[PDB]
Amino acid sequence: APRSVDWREKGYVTPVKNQGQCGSCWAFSATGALEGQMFRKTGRLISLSEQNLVDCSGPQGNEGCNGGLMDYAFQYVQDNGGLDSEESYPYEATEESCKYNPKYSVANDTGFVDIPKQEKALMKAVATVGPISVAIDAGHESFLFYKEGIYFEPDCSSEDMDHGVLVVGYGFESNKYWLVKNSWGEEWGMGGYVKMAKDRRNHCGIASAASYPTV
Numbered sequence: 001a002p003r004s005v006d007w008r009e010k011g012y013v014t015p016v017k018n019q020g021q022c023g024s025c026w027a028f029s030a031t032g033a034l035e036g037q038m039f040r041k042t043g044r045l046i047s048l049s050e051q052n053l054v055d056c057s058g059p060q061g062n063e064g065c066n067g068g069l070m071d072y073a074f075q076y077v078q079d080n081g082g083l084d085s086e087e088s089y090p091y092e093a094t095e096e097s098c099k100y101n102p103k104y105s106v107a108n109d110t111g112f113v114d115i116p117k118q119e120k121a122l123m124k125a126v127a128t129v130g131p132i133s134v135a136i137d138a139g140h141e142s143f144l145f146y147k148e149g150i151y152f153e154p155d156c157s158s159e160d161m162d163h164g165v166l167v168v169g170y171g172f173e174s175n176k177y178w179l180v181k182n183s184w185g186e187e188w189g190m191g192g193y194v195k196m197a198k199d200r201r202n203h204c205g206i207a208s209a210a211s212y213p214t215v
């Protein structure tokens with residue numbers, strides 16, 4: 001159980017992406033976690049398609065630009081046997097017709113693992129699996145305008161998370177934080193990342209809906 005962890009240092013994370021004005025955060029959180037597992041498997045990091053998730057994962061329960069869950073995304077990837085790369089199926093920040101094409105699938109999983117709802121549990125998955133999809137309460141103006149530092153919202157709900165994101169590690173400043181990759185672009189926060197209060201009673205419920213695909 002290491003002191004600090006940062007999967008960006010090992011080539012597991014793709015650059016920061018932008019969901020644009022579309023409620024497809026679940027999809028970016030999903031591709032993020034998937035991108036990291038495939039890497040741990042094949043050794044190759046390849047950006048995955050969120051538009052692929054937004055357009056065809058309705059059967060599993062997702063609502064495209066109107067909402068979804070990372071697990072419905074892993075499930076879709078499981079029932080569909082594959083997922084098209086980002087290049088092949090570019091992102092358009094809007095719901096289009098399903099255009100999946102097996103010829104371009106570059107990833108796949110065989111389920112997912114819902115992590116026990118405890119921060120200590122999240123810490124081990126992060127330390128021993130890689131980037132983890134999680135959901136936090138980001139419905140506060142302070143989060144939207146987070147610039148840098150360790151984010152702490154004494155108004156954050158640990159039960160009503162509304163934003164899916166990617167935990168890429170954790171550490172502490174010379175005070176413990178979770179390293180989180182957001183999908184609002186690199187202009188947001190610290191190059192698109194945020195350091196969130198760690199071991200502070202599941203702040204914003206970050207450890208309450210953690211999960212990752214099994215490839």
Ligand SMILES: CSCC(NC(=O)Cc1ccc(-c2ccccc2)cc1)C(=O)NC(CCCNC(=N)N)C(=O)N[C@@H](Cc1ccccc1)C(=O)NCCc1ccccc1
Pocket residue numbers: 018019020021022023024025026061062063065066067068069070134135138139140161162163164184185209
């Ligand atoms: C504060 S940002 C929240 C959010 N995002 C958005 O609503 C949209 C949004 C998109 C881009 C920017 C943006 C800002 C600056 C620069 C560039 C872009 C801002 C907001 C969202 O709620 N997304 C949804 C759909 C809307 C739900 N209800 C509501 N707003 N009142 C979403 O699906 N969130 C997931 C998160 C989550 C994932 C996994 C576990 C727990 C929670 C969710 O709530 N999922 C559960 C609900 C659902 C399930 C199936 C179909 C539809 C909805």
